[PDB]
């Protein structure tokens, strides 16, 4: 079980593609309506971490939460028929099953999952809780509409000639999604989030943009990862100014940004040397 507080400043961008698409809008990434900053949900990073663990582990005591062929009720029923089948008086039986699943599953240990279906077994508050990403420069939507020379269904739209089904494949030119996230210790002591699991989660967050790739998302990479390791379980300084110390703004006289040569990640670790640490894993 970990005992320190970690305030990591995850920074990642996108070369050309659709990163975190659709708040129910067709196929466009989440962007700020009032301004234009791109937004990326934390569930995408969580799924990338899960895929990295699935491809770089394959062992027990670290379940990866299977994909489409994985009914949650079936997994809950399978985890219930272990040490606490019935002889545990429902109440503490749910807590025992939750602890067993935390010791067996890695997704519920790092983040969490819903285990309150049919056979209830409590719920996990979750130690590591990432937030929604947000860029700084107002990104623009390219919308790269592409075609296909093969129809899908046999409906009336399939003409006698070129059976075509076009559509749109949205793309993004740039946008350093300044992600945020905090890690607690009280829930980590209950879920069993040890330091080895924390190191595995850091490695996944660092090297998830090298394997989890597709045609819609294109090419994505992680810039830097500045983890703010604390000293105790108390609160020293508000995390707002702590995350504001690593500001990311524009460089010289430029309108937009295209790569890392147009951003100036101002890192001035001066006032965060009281009772906190600093490490660089991705940058």
């Amino acid at each position: 079980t970990i005992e320190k507080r970690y305030d990591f400043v995850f920074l990642f961008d996108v070369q050309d593609g659709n990163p975190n698409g659709d708040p129910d809008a067709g196929n466009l990434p989440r962007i700020d309506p009032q301004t234009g900053e791109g937004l990326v949900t934390d569930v995408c990073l969580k799924r990338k971490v899960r895929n990295f663990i699935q491809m770089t582990q394959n062992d027990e005591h670290h379940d990866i939460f299977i994909r489409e062929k994985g009914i949650l009720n079936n997994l809950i029923d399978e985890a219930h028929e272990q040490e606490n089948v019935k002889g545990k008086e429902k109440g503490e039986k749910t807590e025992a099953a939750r602890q067993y699943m935390c010791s067996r599953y890695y997704d519920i240990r790092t983040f969490g999952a819903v285990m309150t279906t049919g056979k209830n077994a409590g719920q996990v508050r979750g130690p590591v809780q990432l937030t929604f990403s947000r860029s700084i420069d107002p990104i623009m939507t390219l919308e790269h509409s592409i075609t296909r020379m093969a129809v899908t269904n046999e409906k009336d739209a399939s003409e006698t000639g070129d059976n075509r089904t076009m559509g749109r494949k949205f793309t993004v030119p740039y946008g350093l999604y300044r992600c945020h996230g905090f890690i607690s210790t009280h829930f980590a002591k209950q879920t069993g989030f040890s330091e080895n699991d924390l190191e595995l989660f850091w490695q996944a967050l660092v090297n998830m943009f090298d394997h989890d790739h597709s045609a819609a998302r294109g090419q994505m990479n992680a810039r830097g990862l500045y983890v703010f390791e604390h000293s105790n379980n108390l609160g020293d300084a508000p995390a707002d100014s702590l995350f504001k110390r690593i500001q990311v703004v524009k460089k010289d006289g430029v309108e937009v940004v295209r790569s890392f040569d147009d951003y100036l990640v101002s890192v001035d670790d001066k006032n965060l040397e009281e009772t906190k640490l600093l490490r660089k894993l991705g940058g």
């Binding site: 309506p33 919308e143 509409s145 409906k155």
Partner: protein, 124 residues
């Protein structure tokens, strides 16, 4: 049951989305997933992100129609709706959020009729 002179942004936005959905439905009867099954989820909140692709896909949807006069009438009513739409806002207020769906279903009801849209188009 439709107010075309309300001068409300949500009303005209909903009417525009409704006529867009009507055009997409008329383009092909065997349509599985329309725009309302994906575009409407953020049409009343982020209209500047969905209505751009909507206006981009509108001419192709009009050309897909078997009748060219139908597309002319649909564009005419689109512009008659957007007359009161001086600008596409960033985000709609709660009252405007409701007026969006209000105008949407009002325009859908006005369009799915026997003699109404053509009658209004004849007096222009």
């Amino acid at each position: 049951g439709l107010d075309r002179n309300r001068q409300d942004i949500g009303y005209v936005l909903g009417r525009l989305f409704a006529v867009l959905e009507k055009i997409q439905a008329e383009a092909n009867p065997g349509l599985n997933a329309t725009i309302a099954d994906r575009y409407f989820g953020s049409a009343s909140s982020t209209p500047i992100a969905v209505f751009g692709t909507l206006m981009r896909l509108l001419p192709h949807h009009l050309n897909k129609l078997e009748f060219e006069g139908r597309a002319v009438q649909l564009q005419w009513e689109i512009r008659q709706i957007l007359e009161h739409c001086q600008r596409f806002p960033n985000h709609l207020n709660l009252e405007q959020q409701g007026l969006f769906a209000i105008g949407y279903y009002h325009e859908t009801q006005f369009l799915f009729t026997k003699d109404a849209l053509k009658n209004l188009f004849n007096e222009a």
